[PDB]
Amino acid sequence: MRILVLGVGNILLTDEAIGVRIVEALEQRYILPDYVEILDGGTAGMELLGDMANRDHLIIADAIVSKKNAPGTMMILRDEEVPALFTNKISPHQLGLADVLSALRFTGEFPKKLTLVGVIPESLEPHIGLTPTVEAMIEPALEQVLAALRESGVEAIPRSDS
Numbered sequence: 001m002r003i004l005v006l007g008v009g010n011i012l013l014t015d016e017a018i019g020v021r022i023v024e025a026l027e028q029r030y031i032l033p034d035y036v037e038i039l040d041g042g043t044a045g046m047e048l049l050g051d052m053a054n055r056d057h058l059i060i061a062d063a064i065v066s067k068k069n070a071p072g073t074m075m076i077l078r079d080e081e082v083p084a085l086f087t088n089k090i091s092p093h094q095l096g097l098a099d100v101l102s103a104l105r106f107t108g109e110f111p112k113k114l115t116l117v118g119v120i121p122e123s124l125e126p127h128i129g130l131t132p133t134v135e136a137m138i139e140p141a142l143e144q145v146l147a148a149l150r151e152s153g154v155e156a157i158p159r160s161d162s
Helices: 014-029 046-052 081-086 092-106 138-151
Strands: 003-008 036-042 057-063 074-078 113-119
Touching: 003 014, 003 046, 003 138, 014 036, 014 057, 014 113, 014 138, 036 046, 046 092, 057 138, 074 081, 074 138, 081 092, 081 113, 113 138
Parallel strands: 003 036, 003 057, 057 113
Antiparallel strands: 074 113
């Protein structure tokens, strides 16, 4: 079983750090089996190709910036909806991710399952630090990545039960 939990985004842009902070909280609070890899991919594109390939379940956390919903809204997209979502002209790093997914489809190594847990940002200003409204969404987003993990048969153990 190969599973990757990919946090993507930019810590320097306020709420565009949400993906990276989600995956940092996971790693810090839960004990997971060795076949679950956790990676901070930042704003990288094609350099992630090898990490993303041959995954039974690929879970991505990121800020959703191409939808008109209220700041702080959480959206879960699965399978064919994630490439579609990433094919936009608002976020260049998402378009690079859409190119990586295409390359993987071309070589027959597209993830068997794909889940995106996304949160719509409040502010994208140059600054290190989430807004209060997005910061309150770390826990609920974290529960969603746990649920997606549990759906592939992995149970995460809180470190507090250790």
